[PDB]
Structures are given as structure tokens and as C-alpha cells.
Design a protein around this ligand. Sequence first.
Ligand SMILES: CC(C)(C)NC(=O)[C@@H]1C[C@@H]2CCCC[C@@H]2CN1C[C@@H](O)[C@H](Cc1ccccc1)NC(=O)[C@H](CC(N)=O)NC(=O)c1ccc2ccccc2n1
Lengths: 99, 99
Amino acid sequence: PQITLWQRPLVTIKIGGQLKEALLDTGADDTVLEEMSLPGRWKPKMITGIGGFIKVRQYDQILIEICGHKAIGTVLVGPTPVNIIGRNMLTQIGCTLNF
Amino acid sequence: PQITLWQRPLVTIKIGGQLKEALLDTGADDTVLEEMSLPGRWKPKMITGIGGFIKVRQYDQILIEICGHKAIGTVLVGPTPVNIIGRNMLTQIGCTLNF
Ligand SMILES: CC(C)(C)NC(=O)[C@@H]1C[C@@H]2CCCC[C@@H]2CN1C[C@@H](O)[C@H](Cc1ccccc1)NC(=O)[C@H](CC(N)=O)NC(=O)c1ccc2ccccc2n1
């Protein structure tokens, strides 16, 4: 698709067969998710945003479908108000910024 | 241009006649820049992202060039770790997400 930005670029994602929605976020290095059921073990990790550091749970090799495109990588579960799809995933689905 | 996301989408901006660089940030509602001099009156504001709040000064109808493209809007000045260009400005230059 070609997505304008007059509203937040939220899209449908699928993880563990669960349908969610998430923000396509070119400003985010990592992918950070709301609480949800994920397989495997996690490890504690800390990342920062504009307001400072948070503790998150790091899951590796997670499969996700983003607006129909498959991606696999590291996802961080933590105190985020919204699922955020960061560049580690965005690149896998061929996403670009255009103007 | 077309900007891939293998690295941070940083671009040149010009504001207050000064050249800086900033992050093209589709996940950000607002545009937030490091401490700097701007004209007019400001209003105090608090914004959030991941990790909590920061206090900023809000300036309205500020002129900025983004990669040579003119935009006018609200700029928030404060202790952000990185200059970020949010959707309020990105929309003025016709920026889209494409995959
Ligand atoms: C996700 C993580 C890996 C933590 N990366 C980010 O946090 C990086 C960090 C880099 C340096 C510090 C400054 C931000 C740049 C950008 N951000 C991504 C960046 O895209 C971040 C993503 C976002 C969506 C909303 C909720 C939180 C997170 N957006 C932002 O921080 C901007 C700040 C701003 N006023 O515009 N926040 C939002 O526009 C914002 C939106 C609505 C809100 C609702 C509830 C909660 C918090 C609220 N957040």
C-alpha cells in the first residue's frame, strides 16, 4: 500500500494466529509489543524512548505477519501504549519512506 | 526521494536559519527538537512516548525546511535525545509509507 500520515499508520498484524494492530514506526529501532501470548523463553532487556528507559521482555525468532507480509525477528514486550513495528521488521517487508 | 530503513531515516532540516539533522518519524504525532532559539511566545507542554514524560516549550506556526521541502507547523523544543520530525510536519511534504 501507499500510506499517508494524516492519522497514525496503524495496520493489522498477526502473531500466534492472533490478530492485532500496530504502528508502522520509522523512528523505532526495535519492535515493542503490548502484553500478548508468545512462545519460548524471554530475557530481561532495557530500552529507552523519548521519556527514558523501560524494562522489557525480549523474545527471539518471532514470526509476524504485517499487512500480509511475513517477517521474523526479535520482539520486545513491555509497557507500550501501542504495538510498534520498528525498523528491524519494517525492512523485511520492503517498507520505505517516500516524498 | 525513496528512503530505505536499513539505517535511521535522518535528514537535513533548516530551522531558524540553522542547519540540523533530524529523524523522519512516522510513529511520532509531534515534531520535537533539542534546545534552540525560536521566535514568538511559547506555551509549556508535556509529551510522552515510551518511558514517561518530558517538559517542552511549544511554538506555533514555525517554518522548517525538510530535505529542501517547506513545512509550517508546531515545533516542540526540549530535552529530547534526538531531533524527531513527526506526522504534523511529515504530512505537509506528502510523506508516505510504501510496501
Ligand atoms: C520504541 C523504542 C524502540 C522505545 N523507540 C522509540 O521510542 C523512539 C526513540 C528515539 C529517541 C528518543 C526520542 C524518540 C526517538 C523515537 N521513538 C519512536 C517514536 O516513534 C515514538 C513511538 C511511539 C508511539 C506512541 C507511544 C510510544 C511510542 N513516538 C514518540 O515518542 C512520540 C513523542 C511525540 N510527542 O510525538 N510519541 C507519540 O506520538 C505518542 C503518541 C500518543 C501517546 C499515547 C499514549 C502514550 C504515549 C503517547 N505517545
